[PDB]
């Protein structure tokens, strides 16, 4: 059992590490989208003036 647990724990780390990498990557993508969205809002305000 110990052996198995050890094996599982070791496995858990790999998936979690890739999970964090994907999450941070996905977050970097969101940050870029929010910047563009704000850019369109500011342009619309200047067109109203």
């Amino acid at each position: 059992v110990k052996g198995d647990y050890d094996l599982q724990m070791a496995h858990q780390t790999s998936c979690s590490s890739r999970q964090d990498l994907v999450c941070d990557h996905l977050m970097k993508q969101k940050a870029s989208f929010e910047l563009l969205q704000l850019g369109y809002e500011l342009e619309l305000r200047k067109h109203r003036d």
């Binding site: 970097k28 969101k30 940050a31 870029s32 910047l35």
Partner: protein, 51 residues
Amino acid sequence: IQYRCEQLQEIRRASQREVMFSAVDPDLSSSTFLEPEVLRDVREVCKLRFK
């Protein structure tokens, strides 16, 4: 009206300026190529949001 046209003309002129982005050759460690201001400013703003 003239004041506004001058402002938009300045933006048009600034837009024609080609910003050169350096080729990511992996291997080449060191060359300190200077990052364009726009890329720096955009990166910082995106980092700040990412954090």
